[PDB]
Amino acid sequence: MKSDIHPAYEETTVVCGCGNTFQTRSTKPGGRIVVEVCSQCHPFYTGGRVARFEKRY
Amino acid sequence: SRNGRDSAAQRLGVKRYGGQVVKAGEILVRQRGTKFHPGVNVGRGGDDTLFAKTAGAVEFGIKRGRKTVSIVG
Amino acid sequence: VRPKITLACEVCKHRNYITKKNRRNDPDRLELKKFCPNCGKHQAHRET
Amino acid sequence: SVSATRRISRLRRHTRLRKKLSGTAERPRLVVHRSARHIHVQLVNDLNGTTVAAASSIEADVRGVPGDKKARSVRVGQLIAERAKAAGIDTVVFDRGGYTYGGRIAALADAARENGLSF
Amino acid sequence: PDSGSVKVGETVKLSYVDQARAGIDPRKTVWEVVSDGLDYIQVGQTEVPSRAYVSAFGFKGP
Amino acid sequence: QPRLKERYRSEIRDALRKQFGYGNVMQIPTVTKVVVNMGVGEAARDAKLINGAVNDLALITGQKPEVRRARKSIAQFKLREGMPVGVRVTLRGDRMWEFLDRLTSIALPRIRDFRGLSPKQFDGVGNYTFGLAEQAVFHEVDVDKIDRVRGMDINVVTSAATDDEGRALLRALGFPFK
RNA sequence: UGCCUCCUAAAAUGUAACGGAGGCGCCCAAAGGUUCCCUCAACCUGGACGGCAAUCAGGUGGCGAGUGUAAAUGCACAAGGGAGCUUGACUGCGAGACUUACAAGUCAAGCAGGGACGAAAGUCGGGAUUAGUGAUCCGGCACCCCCGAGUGGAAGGGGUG
Ligand SMILES: [Mg+2]
Ligand SMILES: [Mg+2]
Ligand SMILES: [Mg+2]
Ligand SMILES: [Mg+2]
Ligand SMILES: [Mg+2]
Ligand SMILES: [Mg+2]
Ligand SMILES: [Mg+2]
Ligand SMILES: [Mg+2]
Ligand SMILES: [Mg+2]
Ligand SMILES: [Mg+2]
Ligand SMILES: [Mg+2]
Ligand SMILES: [Mg+2]
Ligand SMILES: [Mg+2]
Ligand SMILES: [Mg+2]
Ligand SMILES: [Mg+2]
Numbered sequence: 001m002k003s004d005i006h007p008a009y010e011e012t013t014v015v016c017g018c019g020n021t022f023q024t025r026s027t028k029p030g031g032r033i034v035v036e037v038c039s040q041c042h043p044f045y046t047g048g049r050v051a052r053f054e055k056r057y
Numbered sequence: 058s059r060n061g062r063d064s065a066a067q068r069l070g071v072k073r074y075g076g077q078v079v080k081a082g083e084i085l086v087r088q089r090g091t092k093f094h095p096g097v098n099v100g101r102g103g104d105d106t107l108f109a110k111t112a113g114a115v116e117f118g119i120k121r122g123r124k125t126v127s128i129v130g
Numbered sequence: 131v132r133p134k135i136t137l138a139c140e141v142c143k144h145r146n147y148i149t150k151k152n153r154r155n156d157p158d159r160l161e162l163k164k165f166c167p168n169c170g171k172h173q174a175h176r177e178t
Numbered sequence: 179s180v181s182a183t184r185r186i187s188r189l190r191r192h193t194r195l196r197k198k199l200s201g202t203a204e205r206p207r208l209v210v211h212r213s214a215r216h217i218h219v220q221l222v223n224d225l226n227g228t229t230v231a232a233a234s235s236i237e238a239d240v241r242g243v244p245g246d247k248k249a250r251s252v253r254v255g256q257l258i259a260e261r262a263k264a265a266g267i268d269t270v271v272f273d274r275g276g277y278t279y280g281g282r283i284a285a286l287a288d289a290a291r292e293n294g295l296s297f
Numbered sequence: 298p299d300s301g302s303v304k305v306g307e308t309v310k311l312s313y314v315d316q317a318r319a320g321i322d323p324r325k326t327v328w329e330v331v332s333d334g335l336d337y338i339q340v341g342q343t344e345v346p347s348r349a350y351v352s353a354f355g356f357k358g359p
Numbered sequence: 360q361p362r363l364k365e366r367y368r369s370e371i372r373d374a375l376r377k378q379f380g381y382g383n384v385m386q387i388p389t390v391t392k393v394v395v396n397m398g399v400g401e402a403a404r405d406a407k408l409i410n411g412a413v414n415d416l417a418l419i420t421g422q423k424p425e426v427r428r429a430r431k432s433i434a435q436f437k438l439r440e441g442m443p444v445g446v447r448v449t450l451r452g453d454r455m456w457e458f459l460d461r462l463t464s465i466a467l468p469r470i471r472d473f474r475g476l477s478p479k480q481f482d483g484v485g486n487y488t489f490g491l492a493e494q495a496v497f498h499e500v501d502v503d504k505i506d507r508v509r510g511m512d513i514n515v516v517t518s519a520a521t522d523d524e525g526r527a528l529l530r531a532l533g534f535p536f537k
Numbered sequence: 538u539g540c541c542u543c544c545u546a547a548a549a550u551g552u553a554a555c556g557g558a559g560g561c562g563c564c565c566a567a568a569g570g571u572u573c574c575c576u577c578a579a580c581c582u583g584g585a586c587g588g589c590a591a592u593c594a595g596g597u598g599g600c601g602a603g604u605g606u607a608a609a610u611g612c613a614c615a616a617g618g619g620a621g622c623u624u625g626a627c628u629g630c631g632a633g634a635c636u637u638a639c640a641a642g643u644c645a646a647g648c649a650g651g652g653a654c655g656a657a658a659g660u661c662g663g664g665a666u667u668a669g670u671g672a673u674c675c676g677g678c679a680c681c682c683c684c685g686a687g688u689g690g691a692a693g694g695g696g697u698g
């Protein structure tokens with residue numbers, strides 16, 4: 001049953017708008033999965049109330 | 058009253074006992090379920106009737122938590 | 131609801147068997163591969 | 179702990195077929211032991227557990243054999259089939275040992291029938 | 298189509314009974330032809346049971 | 360070769376030996392299996408799972424998923440004993456990492472409110488589980504060729520014997536936390 | 538008012554009352570046969586809608602679940618759960634036994650023909666067991682071609698289902 005019922009799954013190079021790209025394997029037809037946000041365009045690297053009257057309110 | 062009805066008794070129990078020379082095919086133990094289990098030279102039967110398969114004496118014993126009906130021919 | 135049916139042979143039409151089936155689960159005629167003593171070999175059997 | 183699921187669930191299967199398949203003094207029982215490296219086999223005579231003839235795949239007559247692991251199964255099946263015939267044995271029952279029939283064990287069975295063991 | 302235009306609108310949900318009756322499969326029975334083997338079906342975006350729905354069209358019991 | 364797998368035994372396998380004084384390289388954890396299931400409880404009405412529950416998990420994962428059946432009947436859920444209600448798939452080995460990479464890089468940092476996810480969602484062994492709200496933006500699916508949206512939840516099974524060691528393993532792969 | 542299970546029943550069998558509790562007059566073309574594999578309920582922790590309880594993962598869990606259907610005896614070795622092909626839910630017999638006033642009822646290894654499954658060993662003459670039934674008479678039907686009221690046929694009779 002590891003034969004011709006599973007969907008098509010070949011290697012797929014993926015690009016982001018940040019420019020950081022990488023090469024994995026997924027089911028997108030053409031190697032053409034396009035994202036606008038990634039895991040290296042963000043931290044996980046480094047990161048009323050009494051301020052009311054300070055505009056002389 | 059509402060009760061009062063019974064079924065005919067079925068004459069179960071052990072029929073040939075230990076140390077008893079039996080001929081080939083005699084009913085050793087008639088029962089419901091496998092209260093006794095077939096051992097050497099003893100077949101079970103369609104309603105758990107433990108017939109014999111060979112002439113010879115009958116001896117009883119334990120085999121792994123199930124009590125047995127066997128024949129030393 | 132379970133009528134008695136009978137299984138005639140398919141080579142020679144002898145009515146060799148008889149049994150029961152459920153008339154609403156099986157609205158069509160049973161086919162089984164049963165023995166036939168006329169022929170001495172297994173053949174097919176439909177109902178009547 | 180999958181080195182314990184494999185032992186517990188193969189003497190769970192080995193005792194499943196051992197009920198209906200016994201092996202006696204005229205028709206003994208042939209028990210294979212498929213490890214990941216070798217295979218062992220012996221003929222056991224279940225009335226007093228007296229093994230009549232064994233043939234392992236660890237001594238030099240099988241260790242010096244060219245080929246893969248099935249090729250050392252076809253050789254050891256030619257051993258006990260001609261080690262039975264010094265004890266005078268001609269029909270046996272085949273204990274799978276709990277394993278599946280196919281592969282290394284089925285190549286021992288079809289190489290033990292070509293030398294006498296009538297099963 | 299070949300030419301022309303078929304303007305539909307998003308204020309319409311389609312239900313289509315057909316001349317070929319191809320939704321009916323001649324191998325399975327009345328309770329699976331319409332209720333797909335399960336027990337409560339969506340009809341009017343509601344929870345009406347299957348056996349009680351087919352019985353509304355005459356097919357009941359046997 | 361999946362790039363998260365080569366990243367695994369290169370330095371992370373070296374990292375944990377400094378943290379715990381082990382005596383064998385067999386006691387170091389490794390993620391063994393990752394399990395995804397929809398759990399479509401709505402599927403007990405109208406059978407919207409054929410083009411609805413098999414195909415959508417197929418493009419997310421890569422292989423066809425197992426449709427599961429219910430162990431016993433429940434009246435209030437309108438659910439029998441034997442009706443299809445859940446759709447499970449399982450990821451082992453070299454397909455597991457290619458789901459762990461592509462979750463944690465182009466799908467999981469499409470999840471807002473960056474406290475990561477909770478590091479208190481382990482069980483007592485080192486096995487994690489998080490959830491997803493809708494059919495996420497795994498970009499392999501498209502929003503114009505789907506039925507109604509449906510979430511999922513994703514198990515991750517490890518060889519850990521305690522939670523923080525399982526937390527130490529899964530942090531270093533691409534799971535954000537706080 | 539017949540049939541099945543328990544108790545009364547005095548530790549074999551058997552045993553009454555208008556004594557005490559319940560069931561049956563069916564169901565299954567797979568819920569049968571076989572080869573192969575698996576272990577439950579309940580409880581705790583983690584989780585999208587999810588709640589005491591749907592689906593998932595991991596722990597502890599030796600029978601407290603399950604058995605088509607009442608109860609008892611049973612069954613984890615599984616008879617419980619799942620899957621692949623199949624029709625032994627056969628035809629010709631049946632040594633020897635159980636029960637038994639009689640009529641009945643029950644069990645049956647083994648022999649052959651022809652099969653199913655299994656690599657073989659082997660198992661299979663319905664169902665975990667015990668109920669789901671009704672004598673004789675007289676008729677119906679299909680087949681075998683046994684007798685055919687002078688002879689050839691026929692009518693009718695007869696036989697095995
Ligand atoms: Mg009684
Ligand atoms: Mg059917
Ligand atoms: Mg008594
Ligand atoms: Mg007494
Ligand atoms: Mg079956
Ligand atoms: Mg079973
Ligand atoms: Mg019959
Ligand atoms: Mg007789
Ligand atoms: Mg034969
Ligand atoms: Mg064959
Ligand atoms: Mg027989
Ligand atoms: Mg019976
Ligand atoms: Mg009269
Ligand atoms: Mg005449
Ligand atoms: Mg006539």
Ligand SMILES: [Zn+2]
Nearest residue numbers: 018037038041
């Ligand atoms: Zn980016």
Ligand SMILES: [Zn+2]
Nearest residue numbers: 139142166169
């Ligand atoms: Zn015929």
